[PDB]
């Protein structure tokens, strides 16, 4: 979870993603609120189909004391799945998202008991 990796599927060709990567990364930064304490990093880009591309990201957050660390994957996924944020993501061409952290049974039970 500490590695903070979120996989995103885009309904865009790989060449289009790479061709405008600066813009894509900044738009993701804007979705996060645009503060200078958050930085979006691209871990990888992979074609999945003619017009489907997976983009793996993480977000580095800086503390008031200058320390930096990655936003945990579960925390970042939780933000992106919020209805308002998901809609903004869909406007960028995102059609899905996944975190790598395998949740514990108690975490899963909590999510089922409180799906919202």
């Amino acid at each position, epitope marked *: 979870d500490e590695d903070g990796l979120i*996989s995103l599927i885009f309904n865009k060709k790989e060449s289009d993603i790479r061709g405008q990567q600066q813009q894509l990364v900044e738009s993701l930064h804007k979705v996060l609120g645009g503060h200078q304490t958050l930085t979006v990093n691209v871990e990888g880009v992979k074609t*999945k189909a003619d017009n489907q591309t997976e983009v793996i990201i993480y977000v580095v957050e800086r503390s008031p004391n200058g320390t930096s660390r990655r936003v945990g994957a579960s925390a970042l996924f939780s933000y992106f799945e919020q209805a308002h944020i998901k809609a903004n993501m869909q406007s960028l061409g995102v059609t899905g998202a*996944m*975190a790598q952290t395998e*949740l*514990s049974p108690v975490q*899963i039970k909590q999510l089922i008991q409180n799906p919202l």
Partner: nanobody
Amino acid sequence: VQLQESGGGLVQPGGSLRLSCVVSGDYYAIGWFRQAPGKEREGVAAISSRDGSTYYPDAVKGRFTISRDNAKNTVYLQMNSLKPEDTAVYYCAADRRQRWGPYYYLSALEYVYWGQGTQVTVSS
């Protein structure tokens, strides 16, 4: 989490089959995946434990339905109007990673827990 399927068989075109899988352990996502001879595993149905949303590829829409009886810890795949192109080994699989969208619900790559599979053959 452990999975064991049942319900496969030899089916005539237009016929029905109902698969079952008994599940032990908690999961975020569970689905059915099929693999025809020499081909890749493809997702045919998935469900979210969090909100009960379901996902299907167009090729089985209206014909396949995934459901659960949580009392029995069992998930089902009801398959109607079967066609020879549906012939395959069918697997139940589960995973504990969060996701949204059909791609990650239906991609076999994104499930870590696999059943043993049950054969489904559709022929006249």
